[PDB]
C-alpha cells in the first residue's frame, strides 16, 4: 500500500457504461493486469521503490537484454529478415539511452549495412532486398549513433538522392519503396534521411515527379500532410484513414523539418482539434498512451505519442531566444512514468507493450525513448548547428529534474533513472544528429 501512489493510479475510472462489448472486455482485462503492478504489489517487481512507490529502472537487466538482441537468432525468427536494420537501430538506440558508448560497434555496423546497400541507391533489409525508406532511416540513424568517417563514407549519397527522387509522388507524399505503399511514415523516413545526409533540395533532373510540376523534395509535402488530418483531430497514415499516434508523430516531425514549429504546424494542422485528440491518448489508471480512440495503452507509444508533445508545445510556445513563457507539459509525465516503470519492465530484462506480453527490442527502445522525453525540456531556438532544415537543427535541451511532493506536472522517476536526451525529430542523441549533418554539409556532392 505505498502512500506515495495517488488513488488515480489505484482504481478504475469513476464512470462505467452498463453495455459490454469486445472493446470494454479488453480494456477491463488490461486495467486489471495493470493495477497490481501500478500498486507495486506484484511479485514480479524488483526494487528499490522510490518515494512515489515506483520501482527503479532496471538498467543492468535492460543493458544485457539489448546487447543480447544484437547477436544471432534461430531459423524460427525468419520473419525479421526484412527488418534487420531496425533490429540494429532499436538496440543501439536503447544502449545509447542507457548511457553506453556505442562507438565500438562502428566496424560491425559498417559490415552489416555494406551488403544491404544497393548500387542503384538506398538501403534495404539485407542482401538482395530492394531499397526501402524505413531500412534506410534505420541504417542512417545507426550510422549517426556509432559515428566516424568510415561509417559516414559508407553511404552513396548521390545514388540515395536519385533513388529517393523516384519515391516522390504527384500528390506530394512518398512511397516507402518502388511499387510500395504511400503513407506518412514514408514521408517522415525519407525527409529524415534527406536532412541528415544534406541531400540536394531539388529533385533529380530526371525524376518522374517533375512531369507533375514538382521541383523539390518538399514541394506539395506539407499540403499532403494536411490532407492526412482527420475529423478527430489526429493524423492518419494516408488520407481518409483513422487517426493514429504513430502517424501523428511522423507528420508533426516531418512538418518541423520544413520550418519553425510555430509557423508550419498551425498553418497545415488544425491545432484546435489536434490538441484534445493528443491529450485523449492518455488513460488512467494505466498512465500510458494508446495509439487510437478506444484501443489499448502500449509502451511504444511513450515515444510515438510522447514525442508529439515537445513538437506541439514548441508550436504553441514559439522559438526560444538564447538572449519566454511556456505552455508547459500538457500531458501527465507522472502517468507515463508510472506506466513505463511499474508496468512495462520485464523481470528478466527488456521492456514490453503491456503486462502479459513478452519483451522485445522494439518496445524496449521506444519505452526508454518515452522515458527520456519526460526527463527533459525539449525546445527549439534561434541558433542552429546547420550553416544554412535550419530549425530542425536548432533543438536544445535542459534537464527536467526529479520532483518532490505532489503536483500536476512532476517527475516521479529518480535521478538514478535518468537517460540520455534524444532529439525529438531524429530520435537519436542531439550530438549524433549534429555530427552527421555537419560532416555531410562540408562534403561536396559527388559528380
Amino acid at each position: 500500500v505505498h502512500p506515495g501512489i495517488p488513488a488515480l493510479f489505484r482504481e478504475p475510472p469513476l464512470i462505467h457504461d452498463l453495455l459490454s462489448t469486445e472493446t470494454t472486455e479488453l480494456q477491463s482485462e488490461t486495467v486489471n493486469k495493470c493495477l497490481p503492478l501500478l500498486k507495486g504489489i506484484h511479485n514480479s517487481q524488483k526494487g528499490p521503490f522510490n518515494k512515489y512507490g515506483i520501482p527503479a529502472l532496471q538498467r543492468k537487466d535492460h543493458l544485457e537484454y539489448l546487447y543480447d538482441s544484437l547477436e544471432d537468432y534461430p531459423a524460427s525468427f525468419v520473419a525479421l529478415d526484412a527488418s534487420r536494420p531496425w533490429m540494429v537501430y532499436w538496440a543501439l538506440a536503447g544502449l545509447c539511452l542507457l548511457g553506453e558508448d556505442v562507438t565500438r560497434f562502428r566496424e560491425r555496423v559498417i559490415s552489416t549495412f555494406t551488403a544491404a546497400q544497393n548500387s542503384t541507391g538506398g538501403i534495404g533489409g539485407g542482401h538482395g532486398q530492394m531499397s526501402h525508406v524505413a531500412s534506410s532511416y534505420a541504417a542512417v540513424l545507426s550510422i549517426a549513433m556509432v559515428g566516424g568517417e568510415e561509417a559516414f563514407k559508407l553511404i552513396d549519397r548521390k545514388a540515395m538522392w536519385k533513388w529517393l527522387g523516384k519515391l516522390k509522388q504527384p500528390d506530394g507524399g512518398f512511397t516507402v519503396c518502388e511499387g510500395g505503399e504511400e503513407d506518412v511514415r514514408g514521408a517522415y523516413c525519407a525527409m529524415v534521411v534527406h536532412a541528415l545526409l544534406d541531400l540536394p533540395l531539388a529533385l533529380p533532373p530526371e525524376a518522374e515527379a517533375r512531369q507533375n510540376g514538382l521541383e523539390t523534395f518538399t514541394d506539395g509535402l506539407p499540403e499532403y500532410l494536411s490532407r492526412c488530418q482527420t475529423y478527430e483531430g489526429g493524423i492518419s497514415g494516408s488520407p481518409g484513414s483513422e487517426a493514429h499516434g504513430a502517424y501523428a508523430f511522423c507528420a508533426l516531425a516531418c512538418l518541423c523539418l520544413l520550418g519553425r514549429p510555430e509557423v508550419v504546424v498551425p498553418r497545415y494542422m488544425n491545432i484546435a482539434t489536434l490538441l484534445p485528440w493528443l491529450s485523449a491518448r492518455q488513460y488512467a489508471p494505466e498512465g500510458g498512451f494508446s495509439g487510437r480512440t478506444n484501443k489499448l495503452v502500449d509502451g511504444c507509444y511513450s515515444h510515438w505519442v510522447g514525442n508529439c508533445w515537445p513538437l506541439v508545445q514548441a508550436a504553441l510556445d514559439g522559438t526560444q531566444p538564447l538572449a519566454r513563457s511556456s505552455v508547459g507539459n500538457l500531458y501527465s509525465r507522472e502517468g507515463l512514468t508510472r506506466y513505463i516503470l511499474s508496468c512495462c519492465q520485464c523481470k528478466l530484462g527488456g521492456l514490453r507493450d503491456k503486462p502479459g506480453k513478452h519483451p522485445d527490442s522494439y518496445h524496449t527502445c521506444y519505452a526508454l525513448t518515452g522515458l527520456s522525453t519526460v526527463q527533459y525540456y525539449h525546445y527549439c531556438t534561434d541558433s542552429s548547428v546547420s550553416s544554412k532544415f535550419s530549425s530542425a537543427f536548432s533543438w536544445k535541451h535542459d534537464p527536467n529534474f526529479a520532483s518532490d511532493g505532489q503536483g500536476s506536472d512532476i517527475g516521479v522517476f529518480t535521478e538514478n533513472d535518468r537517460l540520455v536526451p534524444f532529439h525529438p525529430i531524429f530520435v537519436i542523441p542531439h550530438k549524433s544528429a549534429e555530427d552527421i549533418r555537419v560532416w555531410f554539409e562540408n562534403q561536396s556532392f559527388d559528380l
Partner: protein, 339 residues
C-alpha cells in the same frame, strides 16, 4: 536442395548470400536461416538480377511467401510478374484471400491486394464478393488498420460512397461493438469525405483554406446532417462514455458549419443534479459550448467549472490540458473585459 536439383531451374545459377561474414567484422542481428530459405532466396536474387518474368519465378515467389510473408521485396516482384505475364488476377485474388486468412496481422498482403485491384483491365467494377471477404476479415479483427485502409481505397476507387453495403457493414460492426472507432471513421468518409475526382484525396474538405476551417463542406445537405446527428445521439444513449460518437458528432457539426450549442440540451441531460455524471464527453462538450459559442457574462465561469470537474474527478489524467483550456478561457474573458 529442391531448386538446385530441379531441371526447371538448371538454366539459372543462384546468387549466394553475402551476409558480411567475409568482408571483415561480424554483422549484427544475424539470423541462422533454414537451408530451404537460404536456397530459395539465393534463386530469387538471381531471377531479380536478370529481371526474369516467368512462371517458375512466380512459383518461387509463392514458395518464399509461404516461408516468410513479411518479405516486402518478394511481394513487389511477384506483382511485376503477374502483370508482365498477363496472369489471371481473379485467381491471384483467390490465392491471396487464403494467405490473408492465415496471416491476419500482415499488412504487405493488403498493399499487394490494392496493386492488383487497381487494374481497371482486370477489375472494371467491384467484384461481387469483395465486400463479403472484407467482412470475413473484420469478423476476426474488427479494427484491423490495414484492412480498413484498403476498404477506404476501395470506396474511392469504385466510387462506393453511396453503396448500401458500405453503410450496412459499418452499422453491422457498430451493432456488434458501438465502440469500434474504425467503423465510425469509415462512416465519416462515406458521409462527409471529399469525393472530387479532380482533387488529391483528403480526410477532410477545405484543406486549401485556413486550418481552423478544415473540414467545412462547400455545399451542405441539411437533411443528411440532421440524420447523422440523430444517429449519433441514438448510439450515445446506448453507452454515453463511448468517445467515438461524440467525436463523430463534432466532426459532423464542423463539416456542416454548425455550432456545438446545437447539442447543449442533449449534453446537459447526462449531467443532472452534487452532480450525477453519465459521460465525461458531455462535460467537455458543455465546456466548449460555454467557452466559445456563448458571449454572455457568466459563461466563462461555467466553462471553467466544467473543466474543473474534468481535472478533479472525471478525466484527471488530462489535468494539464484542462488547465491549459482554463488559462485560455481566463485570458479570453479578461481581454473581453478590457473592452
Amino acid at each position: 536442395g529442391k531448386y538446385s536439383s530441379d531441371p526447371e531451374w538448371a538454366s539459372i545459377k543462384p546468387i549466394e548470400l553475402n551476409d558480411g561474414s567475409d568482408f571483415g567484422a561480424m554483422p549484427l542481428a544475424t539470423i541462422s536461416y533454414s537451408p530451404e530459405y537460404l536456397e530459395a532466396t539465393s534463386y530469387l536474387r538471381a531471377v531479380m538480377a536478370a529481371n526474369e518474368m516467368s512462371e517458375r519465378a512466380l512459383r518461387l515467389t509463392g514458395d518464399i511467401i509461404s516461408m516468410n510473408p513479411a518479405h516486402y521485396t518478394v511481394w513487389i516482384y511477384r506483382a511485376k510478374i503477374l502483370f508482365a505475364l498477363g496472369k489471371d488476377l481473379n485467381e491471384e485474388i483467390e490465392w491471396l484471400n487464403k494467405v490473408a486468412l492465415k496471416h491476419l496481422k500482415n499488412y504487405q498482403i493488403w498493399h499487394h491486394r490494392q496493386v492488383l485491384m487497381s487494374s481497371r483491365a482486370h477489375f472494371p467494377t467491384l467484384p461481387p464478393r469483395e465486400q463479403d471477404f472484407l467482412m470475413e476479415m473484420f469478423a476476426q479483427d474488427a479494427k484491423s488498420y490495414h484492412v480498413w485502409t484498403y476498404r477506404h481505397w476501395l470506396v474511392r476507387h469504385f466510387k462506393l460512397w453511396d453503396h448500401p453495403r458500405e453503410i450496412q457493414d459499418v452499422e453491422a460492426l457498430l451493432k456488434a461493438d458501438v465502440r469500434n472507432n474504425s467503423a465510425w471513421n469509415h462512416r465519416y468518409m462515406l458521409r462527409f469525405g471529399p469525393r472530387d475526382e479532380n482533387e488529391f484525396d483528403a480526410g477532410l474538405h477545405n484543406t486549401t483554406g485556413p486550418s481552423s476551417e478544415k473540414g467545412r463542406l462547400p455545399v451542405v445537405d441539411e437533411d443528411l446532417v440532421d440524420s447523422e446527428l440523430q444517429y449519433s445521439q441514438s448510439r450515445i444513449l446506448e453507452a454515453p462514455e463511448n468517445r467515438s460518437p461524440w467525436s463523430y458528432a463534432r466532426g459532423v457539426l464542423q463539416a456542416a458549419g454548425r455550432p456545438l450549442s446545437e447539442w447543449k440540451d442533449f449534453a446537459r441531460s447526462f449531467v443532472v443534479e452534487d452532480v450525477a455524471v453519465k459521460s465525461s464527453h458531455a462535460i467537455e462538450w458543455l465546456a466548449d459550448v460555454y467557452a466559445e459559442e456563448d458571449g454572455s457574462e457568466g459563461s466563462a465561469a461555467e466553462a471553467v467549472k466544467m473543466l474543473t470537474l474534468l481535472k478533479e474527478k472525471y478525466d484527471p489524467i488530462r489535468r494539464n490540458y484542462w488547465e491549459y483550456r482554463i488559462r485560455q478561457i481566463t485570458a479570453s474573458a479578461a481581454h473581453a473585459t478590457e473592452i
